[PDB]
Amino acid sequence: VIVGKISFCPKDVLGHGAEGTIVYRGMFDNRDVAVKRILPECFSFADREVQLLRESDEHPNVIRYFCTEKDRQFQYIAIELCAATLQEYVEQKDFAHLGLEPITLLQQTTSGLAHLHSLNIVHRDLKPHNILISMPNAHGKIKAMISDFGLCKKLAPGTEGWIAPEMLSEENPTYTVDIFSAGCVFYYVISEGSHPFGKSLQRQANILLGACSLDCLHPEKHEDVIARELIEKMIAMDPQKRPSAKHVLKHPFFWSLEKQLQFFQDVSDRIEKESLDGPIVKQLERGGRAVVKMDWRENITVPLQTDLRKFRTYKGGSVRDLLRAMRNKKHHYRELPAEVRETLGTLPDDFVCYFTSRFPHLLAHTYRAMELCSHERLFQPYYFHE
Amino acid sequence: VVIVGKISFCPKDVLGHGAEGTIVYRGMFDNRDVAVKRILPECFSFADREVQLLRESDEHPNVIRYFCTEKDRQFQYIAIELCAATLQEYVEQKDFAHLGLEPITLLQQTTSGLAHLHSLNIVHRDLKPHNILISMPNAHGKIKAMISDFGLCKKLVPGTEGWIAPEMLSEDNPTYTVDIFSAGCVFYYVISEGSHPFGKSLQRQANILLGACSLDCLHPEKHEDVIARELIEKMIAMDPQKRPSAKHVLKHPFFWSLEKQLQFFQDVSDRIEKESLDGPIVKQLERGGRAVVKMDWRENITVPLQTDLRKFRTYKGGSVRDLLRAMRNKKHHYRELPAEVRETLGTLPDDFVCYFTSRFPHLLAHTYRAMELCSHERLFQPYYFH
Numbered sequence: 097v098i099v100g101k102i103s104f105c106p107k108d109v110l111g112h113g114a115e116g117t118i119v120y121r122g123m124f125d126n127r128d129v130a131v132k133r134i135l136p137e138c139f140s141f142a143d144r145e146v147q148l149l150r151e152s153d154e155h156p157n158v159i160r161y162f163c164t165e166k167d168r169q170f171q172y173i174a175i176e177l178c179a180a181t182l183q184e185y186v187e188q189k190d191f192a193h194l195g196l197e198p199i200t201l202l203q204q205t206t207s208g209l210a211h212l213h214s215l216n217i218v219h220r221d222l223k224p225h226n227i228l229i230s231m232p233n234a235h236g237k238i239k240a241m242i243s244d245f246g247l248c249k250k251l252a253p254g255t256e257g258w259i260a261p262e263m264l265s266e267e268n269p270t271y272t273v274d275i276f277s278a279g280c281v282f283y284y285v286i287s288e289g290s291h292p293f294g295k296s297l298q299r300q301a302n303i304l305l306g307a308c309s310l311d312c313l314h315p316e317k318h319e320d321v322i323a324r325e326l327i328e329k330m331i332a333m334d335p336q337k338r339p340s341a342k343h344v345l346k347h348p349f350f351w352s353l354e355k356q357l358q359f360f361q362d363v364s365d366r367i368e369k370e371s372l373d374g375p376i377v378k379q380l381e382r383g384g385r386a387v388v389k390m391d392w393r394e395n396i397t398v399p400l401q402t403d404l405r406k407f408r409t410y411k412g413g414s415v416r417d418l419l420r421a422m423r424n425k426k427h428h429y430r431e432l433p434a435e436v437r438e439t440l441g442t443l444p445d446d447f448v449c450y451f452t453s454r455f456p457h458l459l460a461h462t463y464r465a466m467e468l469c470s471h472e473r474l475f476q477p478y479y480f481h482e
Numbered sequence: 483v484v485i486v487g488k489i490s491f492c493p494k495d496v497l498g499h500g501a502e503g504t505i506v507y508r509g510m511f512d513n514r515d516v517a518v519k520r521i522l523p524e525c526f527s528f529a530d531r532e533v534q535l536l537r538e539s540d541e542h543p544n545v546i547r548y549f550c551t552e553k554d555r556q557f558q559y560i561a562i563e564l565c566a567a568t569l570q571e572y573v574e575q576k577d578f579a580h581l582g583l584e585p586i587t588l589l590q591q592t593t594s595g596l597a598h599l600h601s602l603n604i605v606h607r608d609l610k611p612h613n614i615l616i617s618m619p620n621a622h623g624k625i626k627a628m629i630s631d632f633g634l635c636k637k638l639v640p641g642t643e644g645w646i647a648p649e650m651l652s653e654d655n656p657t658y659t660v661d662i663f664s665a666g667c668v669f670y671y672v673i674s675e676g677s678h679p680f681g682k683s684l685q686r687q688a689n690i691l692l693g694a695c696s697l698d699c700l701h702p703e704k705h706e707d708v709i710a711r712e713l714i715e716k717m718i719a720m721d722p723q724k725r726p727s728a729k730h731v732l733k734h735p736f737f738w739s740l741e742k743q744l745q746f747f748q749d750v751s752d753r754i755e756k757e758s759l760d761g762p763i764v765k766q767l768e769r770g771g772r773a774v775v776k777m778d779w780r781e782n783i784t785v786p787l788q789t790d791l792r793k794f795r796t797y798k799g800g801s802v803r804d805l806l807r808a809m810r811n812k813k814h815h816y817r818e819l820p821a822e823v824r825e826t827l828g829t830l831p832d833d834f835v836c837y838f839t840s841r842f843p844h845l846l847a848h849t850y851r852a853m854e855l856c857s858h859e860r861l862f863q864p865y866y867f868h
């Protein structure tokens with residue numbers, strides 16, 4: 097069959113979508129593409145939205161729509177032919193092979209989700225199937241792409257299991273609905289096949305009555321704590337407390353070891369200080385407590401105990417002074433004894449992991465609370481805020 | 483003005499939307515207006531060798547009519563009796579009117595059309611409020627009900643979530659039993675003015691897979707609600723083999739008028755005078771109490787009636803048989819009874835039968851089930867079937 101410029105194979109089916117939709121493997125202009133046939137009485141294409149993207153800067157992780165065309169009964173859309181969807185990346189054998197790690201994948205999808213939003217474009221159907229795995233491009237690498245934006249069902253809403261609770265109270269509505277879905281996807285990737293709600297049949301029902309659950313995340317691991325406090329922030333029943341896409345990118349979830357070590361450093365430099373007794377210092381001491389494991393001077397290694405024993409100065413039941421001690425030993429790292437650098441460092445990876453693995457809640461605890469200074473220039477790398 | 487002769491239809495005149503892109507319009511077949519359903523061959527297949535079986539035997543008043551099927555390049559069309567609405571609009575649309583017919587005979591009709599299907603060995607597989615239709619005012623004004631959308635097979639999972647029998651999701655080939663289940667849900671759906679047994683939007687199919695069931699609207703002391711409950715909970719039975727056939731449902735006391743029930747009590751009594759008791763049959767209707775009798779039925783009857791049979795006899799009081807026996811006899815000479823006795827009882831045969839039925843809400847239920855040993859017998863053919 098042909099409509100020109102597409103052009104697809106009658107029985108070369110790629111899969112089946114909702115409301116009769118069907119996707120084939122086709123050609124355009126001479127390259128290989130994917131052809132999605134839609135019933136105009138079911139799905140309404142957003143020309144004014146696809147137009148905005150076309151005329152703005154192109155994003156690596158937001159798929160392209162080469163062109164659209166129609167016949168008597170259908171509307172056709174030519175879309176980059178991808179290898180598979182996120183569901184095959186998560187649930188399938190030893191995949192291929194992969195190419196990108198889960199975390200970078202999450203980041204890419206988020207960047208794209210922030211790109212749409214920057215143009216006032218709500219996907220309102222983000223899910224494992226609308227996140228595509230590109231084909232091995234050139235060097236053999238592979239990245240991920242959001243698709244199926246611009247399409248919107250009618251009647252004369254997204255996919256069950258990834259719909260935001262407010263959607264079902266009653267008509268668009270806002271970007272905050274994409275974040276919820278993203279939140280669910282974040283967990284899906286990390287848990288490697290699990291949904292937070294979580295079994296398909298009663299999934300959307302659990303969403304409505306807030307029946308969350310994040311088992312696969314350990315309550316006392318640094319990595320899992322960071323992720324949990326984010327995912328749950330994103331799947332918040334209350335749309336008002338869900339982070340924007342830009343905020344998610346600025347989350348410690350995506351920070352490297354050296355950046356984690358930098359935030360710890362800046363915070364110390366930031367709190368030295370005022371009353372304690374001070375709106376700020378109180379906040380990071382409010383959680384206390386068990387973050388420090390009662391007394392941090394007791395849970396740090398032996399050689400380090402001897403070193404900072406010379407002062408004085410460092411409370412031990414205080415979070416702030418733990419931060420102060422880390423800064424101190426970071427800055428003076430080169431001047432320390434050989435036995436101290438031999439358990440501490442090296443910098444920056446091993447060093448930060450040294451306090452990170454003994455105090456799982458430290459980073460998380462500090463990031464929250466320190467939001468009081470998110471409007472400050474020093475913390476722009478860490479918060480964004482808008 | 484689209485034409486696929488013999489079938490014609492004008493788009494824009496859309497009546498509804500179905501699954502997998504299915505569309506329904508107003509149209510014409512011969513000279514009369516029909517409904518046109520346009521299905522995608524990739525989503526729904528039609529069962530011709532079934533719709534013809536119907537064609538052979540004479541039309542059933544309560545089964546929809548299929549006038550003709552034809553195809554074009556890209557679709558498959560079907561012409562059906564243009565009805566007015568679905569069972570949903572009947573129930574949920576408060577201020578519907580007239581409502582022409584009565585809800586219980588609505589349920590009767592539906593079960594009949596159903597029994598007609600199963601006699602031809604046709605399994606519906608998708609019974610629900612959207613597949614039970616309300617015809618338009620026929621001539622004078624009378625309204626009837628019709629089952630529709632039989633002979634439609636979904637191409638990959640039959641039916642609709644929230645009306646599918648449990649044995650069809652464990653998978654490891656449907657029979658008539660699956661329809662009874664759906665009917666059972668619909669029955670309750672109509673009786674309770676729009677509630678579901680399982681029983682709310684999103685999680686009613688999950689609750690079906692674990693055996694939930696909650697018929698809160700049915701009062702355990704109301705004689706009416708007790709009969710409805712015995713039947714309704716036997717239709718939605720988790721075990722299919724414990725669900726009645728469509729024909730059994732028709733013979734059920736749930737449809738019996740007042741005077742027919744009285745004739746059934748009278749029939750039951752006349753039939754047991756008697757074996758011993760000491761008697762297979764009599765032992766049966768005595769088994770369940772006692773509890774049905776309320777320990778002593780002579781104690782739960784009106785005052786002037788106690789006086790009348792205080793000196794008799796004979797009238798055990800802890801006996802079900804003798805409870806029926808006293809009703810029969812007070813009828814067999816109701817004509818001669820005093821004044822204050824005929825008053826508290828009659829008039830016949832309606833208020834008379836309610837006198838005993840409201841004071842013993844498990845009497846009819848208990849008897850009808852205990853007296854099933856004579857299902858085949860010719861006295862009890864108006865009542866049983868088997």
Ligand SMILES: Nc1ncnc2c1ncn2[C@@H]1O[C@H](COP(=O)(O)OP(=O)(O)O)[C@@H](O)[C@H]1O
Nearest residue numbers: 110111112113114117119130175176177178225
């Ligand atoms: N651009 C594409 N490249 C390759 N496969 C695709 C593409 N778009 C869709 N598909 C395949 O077609 C299937 C149906 O897509 P769609 O009609 O959007 O429904 P859904 O995404 O809800 O499954 C998807 O599961 C996917 O595997």
Ligand SMILES: Nc1ncnc2c1ncn2[C@@H]1O[C@H](COP(=O)(O)OP(=O)(O)O)[C@@H](O)[C@H]1O
Nearest residue numbers: 497498499500501504506517562563564565612
């Ligand atoms: N013969 C008919 N007359 C009038 N309306 C109809 C008829 N058949 C179907 N419809 C309408 O079309 C809608 C969609 O029907 P269908 O595509 O079979 O899906 P479903 O039966 O699950 O709703 C129904 O809700 C019904 O209101």
Ligand SMILES: [Mg+2]
Nearest residue numbers: 225226243244
């Ligand atoms: Mg897709």
Ligand SMILES: [Mg+2]
Nearest residue numbers: 612613630631
């Ligand atoms: Mg219908």
